[PDB]
Amino acid sequence: QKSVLEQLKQVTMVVADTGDFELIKKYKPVDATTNPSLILKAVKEQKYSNLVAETISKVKANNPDLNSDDLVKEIAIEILVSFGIKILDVIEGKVSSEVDARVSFNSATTIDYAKRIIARYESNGIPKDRVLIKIAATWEGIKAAKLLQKEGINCNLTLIFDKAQAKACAEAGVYLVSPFVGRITDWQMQQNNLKTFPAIADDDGVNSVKAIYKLYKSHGFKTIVMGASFRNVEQVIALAGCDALTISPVLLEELKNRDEHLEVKLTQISEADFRWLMNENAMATHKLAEGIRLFTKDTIELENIIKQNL
Amino acid sequence: MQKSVLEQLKQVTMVVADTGDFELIKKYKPVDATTNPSLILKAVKEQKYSNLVAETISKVKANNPDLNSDDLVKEIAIEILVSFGIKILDVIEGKVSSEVDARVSFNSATTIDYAKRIIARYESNGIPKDRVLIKIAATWEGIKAAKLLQKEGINCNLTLIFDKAQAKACAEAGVYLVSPFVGRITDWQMQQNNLKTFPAIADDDGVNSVKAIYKLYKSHGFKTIVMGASFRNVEQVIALAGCDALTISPVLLEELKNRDEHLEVKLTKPQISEADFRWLMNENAMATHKLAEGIRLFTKDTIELENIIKQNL
Numbered sequence A: 001q002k003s004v005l006e007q008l009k010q011v012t013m014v015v016a017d018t019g020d021f022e023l024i025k026k027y028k029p030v031d032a033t034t035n036p037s038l039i040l041k042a043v044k045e046q047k048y049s050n051l052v053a054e055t056i057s058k059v060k061a062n063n064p065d066l067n068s069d070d071l072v073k074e075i076a077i078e079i080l081v082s083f084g085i086k087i088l089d090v091i092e093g094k095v096s097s098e099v100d101a102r103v104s105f106n107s108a109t110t111i112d113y114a115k116r117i118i119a120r121y122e123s124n125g126i127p128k129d130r131v132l133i134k135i136a137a138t139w140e141g142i143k144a145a146k147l148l149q150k151e152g153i154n155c156n157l158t159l160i161f162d163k164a165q166a167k168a169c170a171e172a173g174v175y176l177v178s179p180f181v182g183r184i185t186d187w188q189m190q191q192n193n194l195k196t197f198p199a200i201a202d203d204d205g206v207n208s209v210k211a212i213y214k215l216y217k218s219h220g221f222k223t224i225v226m227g228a229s230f231r232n233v234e235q236v237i238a239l240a241g242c243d244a245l246t247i248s249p250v251l252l253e254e255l256k257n258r259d260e261h262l263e264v265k266l267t268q269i270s271e272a273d274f275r276w277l278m279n280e281n282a283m284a285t286h287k288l289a290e291g292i293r294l295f296t297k298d299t300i301e302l303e304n305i306i307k308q309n310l
Numbered sequence B: 001m002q003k004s005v006l007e008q009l010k011q012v013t014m015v016v017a018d019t020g021d022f023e024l025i026k027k028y029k030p031v032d033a034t035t036n037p038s039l040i041l042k043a044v045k046e047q048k049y050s051n052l053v054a055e056t057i058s059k060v061k062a063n064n065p066d067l068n069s070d071d072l073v074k075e076i077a078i079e080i081l082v083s084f085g086i087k088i089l090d091v092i093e094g095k096v097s098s099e100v101d102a103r104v105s106f107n108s109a110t111t112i113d114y115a116k117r118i119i120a121r122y123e124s125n126g127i128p129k130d131r132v133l134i135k136i137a138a139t140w141e142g143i144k145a146a147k148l149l150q151k152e153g154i155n156c157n158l159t160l161i162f163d164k165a166q167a168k169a170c171a172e173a174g175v176y177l178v179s180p181f182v183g184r185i186t187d188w189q190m191q192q193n194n195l196k197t198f199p200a201i202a203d204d205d206g207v208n209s210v211k212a213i214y215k216l217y218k219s220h221g222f223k224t225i226v227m228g229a230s231f232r233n234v235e236q237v238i239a240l241a242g243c244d245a246l247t248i249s250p251v252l253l254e255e256l257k258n259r260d261e262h263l264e265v266k267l268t269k270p271q272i273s274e275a276d277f278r279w280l281m282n283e284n285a286m287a288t289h290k291l292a293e294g295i296r297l298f299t300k301d302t303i304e305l306e307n308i309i310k311q312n313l
């Protein structure tokens, strides 16, 4: 008779995957995550058009030396931060804000973008303890995160598709990793033209998180495993007990409205090694690249919306 | 006088045979030949070579009695790859391409070491390095290794080329030759659009890829040889007549040898940083998939050959 959402919170850190901060307080998650697709959606849906207009004015005012393209890049960061700030008002934990996906193969520019996000939060009175910087888990992203963590900036290594890939993150001292459960299962279904989801025991996305969790706990890695990007509530339920799960508002609502018993299920690499191991994983090779391309398309669309409102 | 399409092609393009079978090579008279781990495995399994592994083990053990099992297997594998290259060189005037172990494809330093070991093994047999192309997968690390090998006068064949940015980086590194995999690019195109039949030549992504690389090279003054490889049918080869070079399977060479129509000549005459290369490759879903797949398939066959070796130790 307790809801599945309530029971899941007793064994796992529940995180809301959304930039629509007005939806968050219903669910009382500990943390929240945004990404370029979610920010774009929040901006396109217009509930927050005042916040957007006010952000553009402020950045223009404070940056009279920037030409058009530089001004737009700066507003795009300020927007990501303004949504994070509003999220932080309605949660007790941290918000994840993602670096521009276009710098995913450049460690130096990733480091600089990450520090810029942190500085903008600091300028707005938010200390870095409340923020995770999301970075795609290419080799360069991991190398950037290694340095950011040394400087006390916690990172959320996203677009995780392979276990070796997660192990390299942990080896770099990363705060948290996010395996993309639903996209791993999308590949599995696409491979065989499957129209129905696989049994949970045979669901590659669920199994991937299970394997990463078992590796971390047995080796004593402190990096948090946070399953992400789910296709349905059964995939979330399958991972009850995981350190953290970040869940869309639609699935959080399904978990809130479901009253059954929740069974609790869950209780060094060189660059050359990493690239070899990624190469051995056809799904991971494809999905990491695809993830960067899709987040890139959404970041470009957001820039266009900013350009239209200058 | 009138000549077959194969003999006409030799006049405008360097014709190269893509096989480890030296007897077949002999009858098409290509200038160069290319081998790879998949073709070497197929040859090794053929009845003619049933004692080749045991002989090579014998000879290799004898010359290195102090090596551990891993070290030995490795030496036998190079010896086998080189043995097929030598037999091919006995029957052609040009060069043979011999591929480094695909497992070192993300390690420039171990690629360089393997490439020099191949060159040394040929040299031990009296074959100078000007008759050999070392085949390296065109990952960024493969291009870095090739850049350094070329500096030492070791010519490389940069294989598994799927994108014009790889090809441009290879040229910028001064590599001797690049091999775009025409058939495999068309394979992706057909799977992407549920195509039941081959696209028109004008619309064939694999053919167009080589056309684009050839155009880019000539316009930039790059001397790197463009060599189209891995064809699906003879029409794709004919579509590239005039290309610097084309490496063609014996089945397709036989088709060209037997055609007699006129062959119309179709091709006539910023810098890429590592981050730029990785971004451009990332934008190309086909290239990202196909380069990784090519390394995996060559690796699977290299391991299969190692396993044949191990069961004979």
Ligand SMILES: [Mg+2]
Residues within 6 Å of the ligand: B093
């Ligand atoms: Mg000679």
